[PDB]
Amino acid sequence: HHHHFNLPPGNYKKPKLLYCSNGGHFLRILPDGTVDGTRDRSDQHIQLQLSAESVGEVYIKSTETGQYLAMDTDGLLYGSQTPNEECLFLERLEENHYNTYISKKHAEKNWFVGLKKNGSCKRGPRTHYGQKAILWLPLPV
């Protein structure tokens, strides 16, 4: 393992919203595959369904479009039509409260799912432990 194994509570029984306190945005996966953040709670593309492939490993999927969150070889987030190795994330507890999602494929490089204060996605290499951009809070739909 390249990372710790503290896991958050809760489960995957219901769809969730992923809220980033960094800028105060909900993770959004647009129909065209674009990924970003939005402060609009009524947005139809922020509803996500998480599922566990293995303990601590998850897929994050758009309930509206069916697309899977994924991080490409250059660290950019994108919506994938099908599940592949770039769609698996390590879901962990952080600061004894939040949820962090580390790219499983690039786990050794410490690439996290994260949003900047302006709601734009952070590129993998620009993220690291200790940032506010990587801290998520799952919220009911």
Curated annotation (Swiss-Prot):
Changing residue 120 to A: Decrease in LRRC59-binding. Its main location: secreted. CDD domains: beta-trefoil_FGF1. One of its GO terms (cellular component) is cell cortex. Changing residue 122 to R: No effect on LRRC59-binding. A motif (Nuclear localization signal) lies at residues 13-16. One of its GO terms (biological process) is neurogenesis. Coiled coil: none annotated. In the nucleus, phosphorylated by PKC/PRKCD. This is Fibroblast growth factor 1. The lineage of its organism: Eukaryota, Metazoa, Chordata, Craniata, Vertebrata. The gene is FGF1.
